[PDB]
Structure formats: C-alpha cells, structure tokens
Amino acid sequence: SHMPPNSRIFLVISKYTPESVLRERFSPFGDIQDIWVVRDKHTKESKGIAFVKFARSSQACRAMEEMHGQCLGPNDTKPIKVFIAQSRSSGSHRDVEDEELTRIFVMIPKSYTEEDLREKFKVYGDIEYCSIIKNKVTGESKGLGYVRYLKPSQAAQAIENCDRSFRAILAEPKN
DNA sequence: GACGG
DNA sequence: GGACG
C-alpha cells in the first residue's frame, strides 16, 4: 500500500483538473497504483490537491522531475507543483527536499577509492560527489560510501538496480 | 497546498 | 552488518 518508500508524489493542481487528466499525463512515467484527488469534506469538491502512487520510487521521481512546473489545462493559470509525498505516519506535511533524495549509502570493498566508487555508480546518473568513510587517523576505508546524484530519480535508479551486495539505501542527512 | 477507498 | 571530524 505504501511500499516502496518515496513512490508516492504530492500534487498542487487546479481545483478543476479531474482524475482522468492526471492518469493521462502521469501514466507515462511508470506503473500507477493509485490516483487520488483530495476532496473537501463539506463541499465534496477538489481541494486542488492530489496523490499519485507509483510502483517504484524511480517512477515517482521521474514524474516529479518532468511534471513539476507544467500546466494541465487552458483555464489553469498557475503551473502545477509535484513533490515526493510525505508518509501518512508522522510526516508533518513538510516538503521533502531534494537533498534528502539524491544521496545513497552503500557497503563497499575496503579496496575501493572514491574514483572506484564513482566508476561503479556513474551508470545510474550524473554524480555530483562521491565519498568514502575512512579511519581519519590511518586513512583506511571502513567499507562504507556515499554517492550523491544530480537528480532524485538517479539515486532511486541506483538503489533499485545496483548489485544487492552494496546494500544500497537512501542516505540520511547528516543533521 | 497534505491524507479516501 | 550500516553512517558522515
């Protein structure tokens, strides 16, 4: 229902954009599992808010990257906003920032240098920065590393496609 | 502009 | 198994 994480997008749309237009415009980006136009309890009208759940986080991220800022109708004045949605549990409505989506955390052989890591992970997208966690006295690698990509979908692709022995997960922010 | 079926 | 002087 909510698996995998970061596979649901949050939309700020026109109150007059129906679910069918969301399906037509967002289905190219992946396997849609649920489209949900949020309606006001008292008027039963759209609040101008929607959720779209995709089968993969990479699909949700590509949808966000391509569709944020687009318009969906002639009567629509403002562009739509598309974010990765917060979970139902907790998630105090705060917008997920791109910095929380672009960096992955991997287990790697001790022999890897930062350029070895970049070589193995450049195939999933444009890498902004690679680092390896080392003993800062001796310089020896602790076998853990970070890869930050330019786009959230690139980090999602890496997590979904790289060898399972890397144990690739989204990296928590430092603070 | 944030949570149903 | 797992975290950034």
Candidates A100, A129, A21; CA nearest to A67 is A21
| Nucleotide nearest the Cα atom of A95 (by C1') | B2
Residues 6+ apart with CB under 8 A from A94: A86
Using a 7 Å cut-off to protein CB atoms, list the covered nucleotides of chain B.
1-5
Q: Which of A131, A95, A89 is nearest to A3 (CA)?
A: A89
Q: Give backbone dihedrals phi and psi of A44, rounded to 5 degrees, phi first.
A: 60, 15
Residues A78 and A113: their CA atoms lie apart, in Å, by 47
**In the complex, which nucleotide's C1' lies nearest to the CA atom of residue A47?**
B1
Which of A151, A145, A150 has the alpha carbon at shortest distance from A168? A145
Task: Name the token pair of A46.
Answer: 């759209």
Q: How far is the CA of A132 from the C1' of B5 (A)?
A: 46
What the block records as the tokens of A123 is 């195939």
- Distance between CA A94 and CA A27 in Å, rounded? 26
Q: How far is CA A105 from CA A28, A63, A94, A100, A173, in A?
A: 29, 23, 23, 12, 11
DSSP H helical segments within A68-105, as ranges? none
**What resolution in angstroms, rounded to 1 decimal?**
1.8
